[PDB]
Amino acid sequence: DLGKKLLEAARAGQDDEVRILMANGADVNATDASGLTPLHLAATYGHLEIVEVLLKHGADVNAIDIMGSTPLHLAALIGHLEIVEVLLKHGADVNAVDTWGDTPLHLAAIMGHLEIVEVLLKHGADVNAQDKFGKTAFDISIDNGNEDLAEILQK
Amino acid sequence: MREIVHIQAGQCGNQIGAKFWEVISDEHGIDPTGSYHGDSDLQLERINVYYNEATGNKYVPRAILVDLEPGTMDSVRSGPFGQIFRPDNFVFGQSGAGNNWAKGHYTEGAELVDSVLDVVRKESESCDCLQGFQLTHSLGGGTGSGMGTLLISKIREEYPDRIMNTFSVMPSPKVSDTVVEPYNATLSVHQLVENTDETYCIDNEALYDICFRTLKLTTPTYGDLNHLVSATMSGVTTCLRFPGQLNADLRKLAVNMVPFPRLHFFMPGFAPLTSRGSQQYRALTVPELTQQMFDSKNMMAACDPRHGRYLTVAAIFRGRMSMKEVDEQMLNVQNKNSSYFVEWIPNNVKTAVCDIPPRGLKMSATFIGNSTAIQELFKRISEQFTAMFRRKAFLHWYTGEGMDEMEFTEAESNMNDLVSEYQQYQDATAD
Numbered sequence: 001d002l003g004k005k006l007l008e009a010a011r012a013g014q015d016d017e018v019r020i021l022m023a024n025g026a027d028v029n030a031t032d033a034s035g036l037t038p039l040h041l042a043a044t045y046g047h048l049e050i051v052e053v054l055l056k057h058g059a060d061v062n063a064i065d066i067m068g069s070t071p072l073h074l075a076a077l078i079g080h081l082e083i084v085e086v087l088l089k090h091g092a093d094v095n096a097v098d099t100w101g102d103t104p105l106h107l108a109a110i111m112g113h114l115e116i117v118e119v120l121l122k123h124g125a126d127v128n129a130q131d132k133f134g135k136t137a138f139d140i141s142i143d144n145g146n147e148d149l150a151e152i153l154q155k
Numbered sequence: 156m157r158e159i160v161h162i163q164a165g166q167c168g169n170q171i172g173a174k175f176w177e178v179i180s181d182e183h184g185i186d187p188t189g190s191y192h193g194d195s196d197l198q199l200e201r202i203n204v205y206y207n208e209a210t211g212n213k214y215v216p217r218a219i220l221v222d223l224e225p226g227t228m229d230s231v232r233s234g235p236f237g238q239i240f241r242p243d244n245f246v247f248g249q250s251g252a253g254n255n256w257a258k259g260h261y262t263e264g265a266e267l268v269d270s271v272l273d274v275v276r277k278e279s280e281s282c283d284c285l286q287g288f289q290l291t292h293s294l295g296g297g298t299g300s301g302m303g304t305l306l307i308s309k310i311r312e313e314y315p316d317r318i319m320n321t322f323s324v325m326p327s328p329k330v331s332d333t334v335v336e337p338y339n340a341t342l343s344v345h346q347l348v349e350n351t352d353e354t355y356c357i358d359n360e361a362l363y364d365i366c367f368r369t370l371k372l373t374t375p376t377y378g379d380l381n382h383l384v385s386a387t388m389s390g391v392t393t394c395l396r397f398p399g400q401l402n403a404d405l406r407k408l409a410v411n412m413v414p415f416p417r418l419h420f421f422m423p424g425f426a427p428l429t430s431r432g433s434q435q436y437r438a439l440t441v442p443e444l445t446q447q448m449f450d451s452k453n454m455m456a457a458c459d460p461r462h463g464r465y466l467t468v469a470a471i472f473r474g475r476m477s478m479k480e481v482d483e484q485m486l487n488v489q490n491k492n493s494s495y496f497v498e499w500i501p502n503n504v505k506t507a508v509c510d511i512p513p514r515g516l517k518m519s520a521t522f523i524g525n526s527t528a529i530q531e532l533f534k535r536i537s538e539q540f541t542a543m544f545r546r547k548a549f550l551h552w553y554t555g556e557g558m559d560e561m562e563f564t565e566a567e568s569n570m571n572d573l574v575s576e577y578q579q580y581q582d583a584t585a586d
């Protein structure tokens with residue numbers, strides 16, 4: 001198989017196996033055993049130009065998995081500013097639903113990464129989108145203990 | 156019960172251990188080199204609680220310093236009172252963890268642990284009445300959390316009748332760079348609830364908040380916090396470095412503080428608040444001292460006690476003032492806020508007073524608070540954690556180092572029963 005090597009190539013963070021594997025006709029969006037594309041893994045563990053040369057080689061800027069996560073779910077959660085800015089530059093989803101009901105703004109809010117909220121909201125995040133436990137995005141900040149996250153959710 | 160053997164590991168832990176030994180080596184009167192340069196003998200009645208004696212007026216801090224990063228030790232040698240450390244007690248690894256718990260617990264810490272156990276051994280072979288063990292570390296990183304918990308487990312299974320005290324600090328996405336921290340945190344808690352006796356909680360979030368709002372330091376450095384923690388350390392160790400009936404040894408200390416074996420997570424707090432090297436001209440009085448050190452604006456953990464109820468409290472006042480004033484303000488806060496105390500534990504707040512004040516102050520006050528509100532600190536982590544373990548990110552780090560993966564959800568069930576335990580004893584009236 002030639003999608004496995006690309007999957008663990010964008011996950012381990014490399015420039016060579018993301019330059020001449022899609023060259024051999026490798027599935028640019030090849031998944032694994034539950035549904036992670038090499039863009040989830042290039043956006044997730046903290047790698048930049050792999051998401052700029054992958055998202056210009058046919059990467060779906062809105063791909064899901066077994067529980068419902070997108071590359072913006074797995075970039076607003078960990079905390080990589082430039083990967084959320086670029087992932088939104090191609091037209092990602094700021095109001096995606098997964099099996100536990102969370103949206104990427106709930107995940108960037110839970111993990112206390114605040115500028116990801118500063119740009120996820122300015123690009124149209126829904127403050128009235130609730131989850132499996134019936135709490136909005138403005139209902140995460142008042143239960144967290146973080147005032148700086150409740151200041152951007154009421155502005 | 157007299158001798159206390161102290162240990163520091165991890166970046167944060169070694170740092171705060173240094174700040175501790177600074178302020179207390181000045182308060183006890185030891186010079187940088189290691190000779191008694193004090194004035195009052197009040198600083199030597201219980202000096203043996205933290206120093207061995209090398210004959211010739213040499214006060215060797217009964218301490219041990221560890222790290223898997225070979226660097227770290229440099230920050231020790233530049234520590235102005237750092238030459239006083241015993242040569243043999245320097246045990247420094249050379250691999251480094253890089254914010255990884257299983258690397259410190261099942262991998263390389265598993266290699267250096269038996270090297271530390273022997274120096275601890277020859278430290279206990281020269282103690283008259285060895286009290287217990289007192290540790291300093293951090294929870295979000297790699298070395299401290301993991302190797303710390305393993306060390307505590309082995310000491311526990313070699314010394315079961317000695318008190319287990321830990322001064323642990325908290326991760327938060329306000330100071331932590333990486334985000335592998337809501338994993339190492341829950342692991343560390345999983346081991347702490349089951350292996351330790353006492354545990355003091357310091358939240359990085361609180362120290363950032365205090366450095367920004369109060370001290371007006373918009374750009375908080377990483378020593379600005381070590382100041383704030385070392386102060387609290389002197390405040391809560393006063394009961395063990397100076398004479399007095401209240402909180403004599405550590406056993407007594409936990410006795411009036413630990414109502415249930417698992418619930419042992421304190422929320423320290425100090426008044427007044429100062430920056431580094433800035434003394435107090437209008438030094439604080441008494442009603443503002445106790446009116447502050449029971450408010451939330453001076454607490455050391457991001458936990459509003461006004462939401463919960465206090466199980467036990469141990470207040471400590473330092474300096475020269477009026478005794479009646481002290482006890483009176485104590486009971487005043489108690490009964491004007493008897494709605495914040497479990498009325499089914501009475502006489503729950505114990506207050507002592509010590510003569511020698513801390514450095515830069517003439518009157519100070521320390522706080523130690525086993526509250527039911529501390530669960531808010533553990534409902535936050537189990538939120539940063541359940542949002543990252545339901546996704547399984549970075550699990551090849553730990554699981555790919557001999558770790559079980561279910562030793563995670565074990566910790567989630569453990570901490571999520573702990574939260575229900577602090578919520579349990581919040582609304583139980585004396586029926």
Ligand SMILES: Nc1nc2c(ncn2[C@@H]2O[C@H](COP(=O)(O)OP(=O)(O)O)[C@@H](O)[C@H]2O)c(=O)[nH]1
Nearest residue numbers: 165166167170293295296297298299330331380
């Ligand atoms: N207040 C304070 N926090 C620290 C210090 N060093 C590290 N930390 C915190 O501890 C966490 C882990 O960092 P580090 O100490 O390098 O990891 P460890 O040594 O492997 O436990 C980070 O999230 C930091 O916020 C320090 O000197 N002071």
